[PDB]
Design a binder for this molecule. Structure first.
Ligand SMILES: *[C@@H]1O[C@H](CO[C@@]2(C)OC[C@@H](O)[C@H](O)[C@@H]2O)[C@@H](O[C@@H]2O[C@H](CO)[C@@H](O)[C@H](O)[C@H]2NC(C)=O)[C@H](O)[C@H]1NC(C)=O
Ligand SMILES: Cc1nccn1Cc1cn(CC[C@@H](NC(=O)/C=N/O)c2ccccc2)nn1
Ligand SMILES: *[C@@H]1O[C@H](CO[C@@H]2O[C@@H](C)[C@@H](O)[C@@H](O)[C@@H]2O)[C@@H](O)[C@H](O)[C@H]1NC(C)=O
Ligand SMILES: *[C@@H]1O[C@H](CO[C@@H]2O[C@@H](C)[C@@H](O)[C@@H](O)[C@@H]2O)[C@@H](O)[C@H](O)[C@H]1NC(C)=O
Ligand SMILES: *[C@@H]1O[C@H](CO)[C@@H](O)[C@H](O)[C@H]1NC(C)=O
Ligand SMILES: *[C@@H]1O[C@H](CO)[C@@H](O)[C@H](O)[C@H]1NC(C)=O
Ligand SMILES: *[C@@H]1O[C@H](CO)[C@@H](O)[C@H](O)[C@H]1NC(C)=O
Length: 526
């Protein structure tokens, strides 16, 4: 009930799940808190301790702005942090099966949130189900987000960039050294994450420093080749002094600007984060990953293209309606509380919001490819098209392109297409299979029959959880036991993928091929 780790002793708690027991260790520090002088830099090696650490409650979530666009609405507030914010938040959690296993595959979860938001404490990231049902060990970590986590003055150790990534990377180091004591196999570790998480997983495949800290990887609706994924060094620095002039820390010795930025309280930094870009976007990663030359050694699309990544198996996938989520965060004519039937002109205005610094002709090219309908007169035509535009551009096509490029170097890759809409999904129906709403299925939440899900959803989650575990333990995401569809490898030529839903799981080819050729061949040119 007490575990001796390589820098201290931690105590956990016992949880009853499905007439079994799961040991949960909630909130174990992995770094010296990045407060004071340590704000904005790489996380520092946590020195030894003496007590029995009481890891029996989630720790602090890292400082972050809150989605306040729908106060009181579960669909949005579901994602807001559910513990205190604090700069002192570099902690992690561990779920082990009871009784303590021997050489258990380990699953490491990295949340999303546009690199600005998110926390591990979330209800839909609970690792107790996965530990119970599949007797794997689940770990998840809080990493720094927003400018506290990704402010970049390239070169400068006082703020080199990618700090939240190095946070994450330090937590994988912790699992390498400490997960044995918990009964886990450091030689069998599978990273998985969602959106910004999924982009972080793909970045750990590129970053040489991470290659020895995990074996396989799962990417849910995100990859580093996504347009929001990597910030340039050009706009990163523009973004820091714009935050400095906003805080009156405009100096000229770059190191002395940082010192100024550290005696500002975290709330002042959070407030000015928004105004740092002139024309924001619902998917505006104001502070995210950069080519720091330490974690990320080159421009990732080059590393990708030239095969400069950890060779192993990937599991990649996306949801049917990735883009709808964002239309109600600004796009004109859209709301969660009506059917959001927009016209042609509301559509065009919606393009300027999603593509503000894009040529008049560039916006026109999008309108051309998505508004030559399979048939006109349909009133949702414009509403559905803008949803798909955001989805295909921001998630679906980069995921697929990443998987093609990765598979081309000889590794097994598996691609899925999640198309079930949660019966408990709080948002309306036109928004479809929303971005993010597979996570509860992956984590085994429909398995609690007390949780209002339909029986079909329990079956689907069950199969997904098995597939995810089999990929984790055996590099192969099959469900061998029940007479279910086998999941074929994604080859660059044939491009097969597996659909996931309650009805049937069919095997299809070349998802969104026409839409993706536009986005990946003739649209990067504008
Ligand atoms: C769908 O609703 C939006 C906005 O509206 C609602 C649901 O919430 C906010 C309230 O202020 C609204 O009264 C309503 O309760 C509608 O968008 C508005 O549409 C008006 C007419 O087209 C315009 O004058 C407004 O500028 C515009 N506002 C925004 C923010 O877009 C939209 O018309 C509704 N759609 C349908 C089909 O009814
Ligand atoms: C983790 C996750 N998985 C699926 C969905 N979510 C959360 C989410 C919320 N949103 C929409 C607005 C939101 N923007 C971003 O979080 C960045 N996106 O790139 C925000 C708005 C205002 C302040 C701070 C953040 N989009 N996703
Ligand atoms: C850490 O926890 C110790 C034990 O906690 C108590 O006993 C266990 C068996 C549970 O029943 C738990 O709910 C109880 O609170 C304490 O004795 C100790 O003081 C704690 N130390 C710190 C620093 O909090
Ligand atoms: C760089 O930043 C310039 C300044 O932006 C303006 O001032 C800051 C403080 C914010 O309030 C912002 O909203 C303002 O627009 C921009 O003028 C410039 O375009 C940016 N980009 C480049 C390449 O210089
Ligand atoms: C766990 O499995 C790995 C696989 O190579 C093996 O090397 C290691 O010795 C095993 N350890 C235990 C405790 O089973
Ligand atoms: C900036 O200030 C720091 C601290 O005073 C100093 O070490 C460094 O040499 C200065 N750099 C320049 C270019 O003046
Ligand atoms: C396989 O089907 C049985 C019912 O015949 C069910 O109880 C079991 O949970 C299923 N297993 C998986 C992994 O879906």
């Amino acid at each position: 009930i007490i575990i001796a780790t390589k820098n201290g002793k931690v105590r956990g708690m016992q949880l009853t799940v499905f007439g079994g027991t799961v040991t949960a260790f909630l909130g174990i520090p992995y770094a010296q808190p990045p407060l004071g002088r340590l704000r904005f830099k790489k996380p520092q090696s946590l020195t030894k301790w003496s007590d029995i650490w009481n890891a029996t409650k989630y720790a602090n979530s890292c400082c972050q702005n809150i989605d306040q666009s729908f106060p009181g609405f579960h669909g949005s507030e579901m994602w807001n942090p559910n513990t205190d914010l604090s700069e002192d938040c570099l902690y992690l959690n561990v779920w082990i099966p009871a009784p303590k296993p021997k050489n258990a595959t380990v699953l490491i979860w990295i949340y999303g949130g546009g690199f600005q938001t998110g926390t591990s404490s979330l209800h839909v990231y609970d690792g107790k189900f996965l530990a119970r049902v599949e007797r794997v060990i689940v770990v998840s970590m809080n990493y720094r987000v927003g400018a506290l986590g990704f402010l970049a003055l390239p070169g400068n150790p006082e703020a080199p960039g990618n700090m939240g990534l190095f946070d994450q990377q330090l937590a994988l180091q912790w699992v390498q050294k400490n997960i044995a004591a918990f009964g886990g196999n450091p030689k069998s570790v599978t990273l998985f994450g969602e959106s910004a998480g999924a982009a972080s997983v793909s970045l750990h495949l590129l970053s040489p420093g991470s290659h020895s800290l995990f074996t396989r990887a799962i990417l849910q609706s995100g990859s580093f080749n996504a347009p929001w994924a990597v910030t340039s060094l050009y706009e990163a620095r523009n973004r820091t002094l714009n935050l400095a002039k906003l805080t009156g820390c405009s100096r000229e010795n770059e190191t002395e600007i940082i010192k100024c930025l550290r005696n500002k309280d975290p709330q002042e930094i959070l407030l000015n984060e928004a105004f740092v870009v002139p024309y924001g976007t619902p998917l505006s990663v104001n502070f995210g990953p950069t080519v720091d030359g330490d974690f990320l050694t080159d421009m990732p699309d080059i590393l990708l293209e030239l095969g400069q990544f950890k060779k192993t198996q990937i599991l990649v996938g996306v949801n049917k309606d990735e883009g709808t989520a964002f239309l109600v965060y600004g796009a004109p004519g859209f709301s969660k509380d009506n059917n959001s039937i927009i016209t042609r002109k509301e559509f065009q205005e919606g393009l300027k919001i999603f593509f503000p610094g894009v040529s008049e002709f560039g916006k026109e090219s999008i309108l051309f490819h998505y508004t030559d309908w399979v048939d006109d007169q349909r009133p949702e035509n414009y509403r559905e098209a803008l949803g798909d535009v955001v989805g295909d551009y921001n998630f679906i096509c980069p995921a697929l392109e990443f998987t093609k490029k990765f598979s081309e170097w000889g590794n097994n890759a598996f691609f899925y297409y999640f198309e079930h809409r949660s019966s408990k999904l709080p948002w309306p129906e036109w928004m479809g299979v929303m971005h993010g709403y597979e996570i509860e299925f992956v984590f085994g939440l429909p398995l609690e029959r007390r949780d209002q899900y339909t029986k079909a959803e329990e079956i689907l989650s069950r199969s997904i959880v098995k597939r995810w575990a089999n990929f984790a333990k055996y590099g192969n995401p099959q469900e061998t036991q029940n007479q279910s569809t086998s999941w074929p490898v994604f080859k660059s030529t044939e491009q097969k993928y597996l659909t996931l839903n309650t009805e049937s799981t069919r095997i299809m080819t070349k998802l969104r091929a026409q839409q993706c050729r536009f986005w990946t061949s003739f649209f990067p040119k504008v």
